DNA sequence: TCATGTAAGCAGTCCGCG
DNA sequence: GCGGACTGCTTAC
């Protein structure tokens with residue numbers, strides 16, 4: 001097999017590399033890597049190395065990496081550019097793996113671990129590590145085993161061995177319900193003292209040294225705790241055995257309001273799953289407790305135990321250990337679904353970076369571009385200092401707030417990357433500038449044509465047309481990967497809808513789910529077999545289809561994020577290719593493109609309808625337009641349609657056969673106007689929206705920019721079994737809105753769009769009457785909690801104290817003098833409830849850590865004093881009033897003449 | 902919240918507005 | 920009481 005790296009590090013003048021050799025074995029080597037850098041040279045000096053602008057360079061080979069870094073410093077002192085890859089391990093990888101890396105995940109040791117620490121005096125701080133580690137569960141992907149290290153004897157209690165037999169049993173048998181599928185994979189090791197536990201753990205770690213290390217909050221808790229505990233007990237040298245090269249660094253992570261400390265383990269790639277989830281999931285959750293996320297992702301119940309976690313080991317050690325094991329497994333289950341480890345390996349090996357660098361699009365693109373240029377013997381420019389400067393972004397149309405009955409949307413494929421490719425925007429393709437007219441002059445095609453030689457953006461920039469820039473070349477490759485995975489995702493989505501349709505008529509039989517590839521549209525034969533299947537088999541197929549769709553989503557949306565990140569990186573001062581001329585060239589072209597096509601679409605539809613100056617495009621944001629289809633439907637007449645699917649088909653055909661060709665014509669004209677390199681503005685129909693045929697539903701409404709709701713029947717070629725609400729920006733979509741209120745507002749919207757005013761009024765009246773019965777957590781608002789200390793003046797709110805911070809201060813006074821009470825953590829999320837006048841907490845609100853029940857001491861008082869009236873007005877009535885006013889509807893029935901009867 | 906970008910919405914504070 | 924200046928937070932793209 002072809003060799004591939006696992007990890008790479010620079011340690012002084014040595015590269016330390018762990019890798020898989022040509023025989024599939026894990027090896028480690030130390031290489032005295034001699035790096036090269038470059039200086040500009042005279043044209044008279046023969047060279048094969050050129051900078052990205054075509055200027056010749058001489059290669060300077062250094063005796064060692066320290067000599068190279070010192071030379072960079074002297075070049076700065078002289079005032080001359082030091083060219084080339086200054087991150088020497090990236091240069092090392094580029095030299096050692098000069099080919100497309102084909103990796104074998106089965107040879108990569110991925111470790112998932114979690115530790116338990118009993119602490120009677122509050123949260124066990126990793127920097128202090130003053131409490132015994134009393135459990136470790138460490139799953140190894142190569143062995144496919146859960147290694148459980150269990151401390152039986154502690155200063156906080158001596159306990160009996162954990163029983164795998166009790167662990168396997170149902171909760172109703174007094175067991176822990178450790179999943180049957182992992183029972184045989186547990187290797188259980190009890191210890192009579194912590195020192196022997198940790199020594200054996202370190203010997204185990206040496207034998208099975210993680211390449212990828214993950215788990216939940218491992219970077220902020222488990223790793224620093226283990227390192228510091230071992231350091232406290234045995235000394236520094238023993239703790240450094242967590243590094244395969246015996247090197248570690250206490251790294252300071254700095255944010256906007258303070259800093260924290262993590263441990264860098266050289267020769268390991270730490271991918272904390274919480275960080276993977278936050279970057280790659282495209283959710284924003286009210287809580288990031290593993291219990292909350294597992295419930296959301298997997299629909300598994302909360303891990304239930306009695307009393308505080310600080311007493312769980314002594315009261316129920318059996319459950320304590322079982323829950324530690326289950327916690328490790330839940331992360332594996334989440335990854336089986338989301339496939340973020342797979343994604344990270346894919347992206348890391350593609351770029352030729354340390355795997356943990358996938359968190360940084362700037363590092364990722366620096367490496368991709370470096371490797372691309374190196375292939376052509378080209379030499380990358382030195383990174384420079386730049387001041388942070390604001391620059392303009394996208395255009396968003398101000399919509400007229402209203403109901404909109406029939407709506408068809410259109411969207412540009414991968415807009416910013418397509419602009420880069422179309423215009424040929426790159427550091428080395430800049431050709432010059434032209435005199436800019438106001439943007440509206442280009443939008444309306446009255447400005448002088450910018451250039452008859454170069455490819456242009458309406459910000460004034462011109463680009464070469466003779467050859468593709470490196471940025472267009474490399475962005476195209478990732479775009480093409482993204483396109484492939486999106487195809488799989490949408491096929492799985494369409495396949496899911498076939499199964500949902502079939503589930504209306506399930507067969508009374510005992511059978512099995514079909515062995516099919518959900519990434520490809522079901523054949524006619526498969527469709528015929530599905531129509532004969534039982535509900536049990538259909539539901540299992542639906543689950544598998546939906547899991548295939550999730551895998552495709554992960555692969556596609558994050559490749560989209562990477563390419564959109566390149567466009568953004570051009571406007572970040574730390575990017576080697578930072579250039580506000582290129583950043584603005586993209587965004588300004590986008591503004592023109594959207595408004596140009598708005599004009600073209602309006603012109604086209606006014607022509608086909610025989611009107612003048614009427615606005616068909618009701619809204620647009622960045623790269624999408626929303627077109628009113630009322631007149632198109634009315635031109636045939638609603639009574640002519642058999643059912644909802646009939647007018648959906650009609651609009652689908654109209655958009656494809658009439659509108660898309662007109663849109664294409666309009667964009668081809670724009671491409672010629674700007675003299676662009678290649679026409680890549682591909683705007684396709686996105687959504688078809690409207691009320692059910694014959695109903696009193698309103699179909700859709702807008703309240704303002706980035707705030708709308710649509711009843712969608714078909715999305716990007718997926719014809720839904722049941723209509724789906726597309727809601728953007730409204731309170732139903734915000735993590736700050738109480739869970740039960742999101743639910744109620746969604747139903748209000750569903751009723752407005754699908755059923756009408758009377759239906760909405762019925763539901764409102766019921767919700768208002770019954771809502772006080774809702775569980776307090778379900779009606780609590782949520783907020784991130786920053787700068788608690790800044791607004792704290794002797795335990796009371798200082799000037800301009802935010803409402804949620806006021807709540808935290810109230811909580812802190814209520815729990816004061818109790819080391820055991822859950823503390824609110826700076827920068828994390830809190831639940832927030834309003835409090836009625838004259839409550840014993842002495843303020844108008846209270847807040848506590850999100851994802852948790854409020855502590856028993858004050859729970860009863862919170863429940864008694866919760867201000868239901870305020871909660872309802874703020875989270876429910878105020879937003880509903882916004883929706884209904886925009887839609888010209890009433891959520892409460894107005895008085896009429898019929899009342900007199 | 903260490904980690905690519907901008908536009909823009911709503912909650913809430915403070916305070917003007919005769 | 921609503922709106923502007925401002926902070927804080929959160930989405931849409």
Ligand SMILES: Nc1ncnc2c1ncn2[C@H]1C[C@H](O)[C@@H](COP(=O)(O)OP(=O)(O)OP(=O)(O)O)O1
Nearest residue numbers: 411412413414415416417564565568622623906932
């Ligand atoms: N996270 C982001 N970072 C930077 N720019 C972004 C981000 N999201 C969106 N944009 C910008 C660049 C996009 O090309 C443009 C339009 O976004 P959007 O319509 O979501 O997707 P897209 O057009 O890039 O891809 P798609 O092919 O899925 O439509 O907005």
Ligand SMILES: [Ca+2]
Nearest residue numbers: 115116324327
């Ligand atoms: Ca735990």
Ligand SMILES: [Ca+2]
Nearest residue numbers: 411412413414
């Ligand atoms: Ca798009």
Ligand SMILES: [Ca+2]
Nearest residue numbers: 411413684716
């Ligand atoms: Ca699309």
Ligand SMILES: [Ca+2]
Nearest residue numbers: 505507531532
């Ligand atoms: Ca059937």
Ligand SMILES: [Ca+2]
Nearest residue numbers: 411622623624
């Ligand atoms: Ca869009």
